Amino acid sequence: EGIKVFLHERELWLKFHEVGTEMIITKAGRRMFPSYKVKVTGLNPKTKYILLMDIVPADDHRYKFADNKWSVTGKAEPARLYVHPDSPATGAHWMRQLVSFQKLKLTNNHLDPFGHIILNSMHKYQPRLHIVKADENNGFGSKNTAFCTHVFPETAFIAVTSYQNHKITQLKIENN
């Protein structure tokens, strides 16, 4: 309750979103662009929190880009978490500056040893931020605790191994 989350660079995300966001995935792992960063308010300055992200299927389809349009061409193929390095930390710490997840990497390697987030190319995905609160003793592990989940629709994207839409390729270059 009363915890709020604000997406950093929301305008840039929207630029990509309007066109149809694509994120490159590679065997070794590739960072997202834009970077996913958030501002958080309403945390108890004293209580400890764990922040983490996951990236879940946005739907159960597989896609193809053709004639300047994304289309569903079939069912999604048969199907990890990123814990923020600072976790756990006081609400005061989390609120002091932006919470950046820019180190998060995407891979297409189903046998990835690095613990990167594994995605399937030509599938649509939705990043989610989770905030997990410590227990009554301000510790973790001894009880299942309360947590909240924040979903920014404008951060959804299709995973690709190379850019499909020319507008995306142009946006990536102009901004990164």
Ligand SMILES: [Mg+2]
């Ligand atoms: Mg799309």
Ligand SMILES: [Mg+2]
């Ligand atoms: Mg590769």
Ligand SMILES: [Mg+2]
């Ligand atoms: Mg990279």
Ligand SMILES: [Mg+2]
């Ligand atoms: Mg289908």
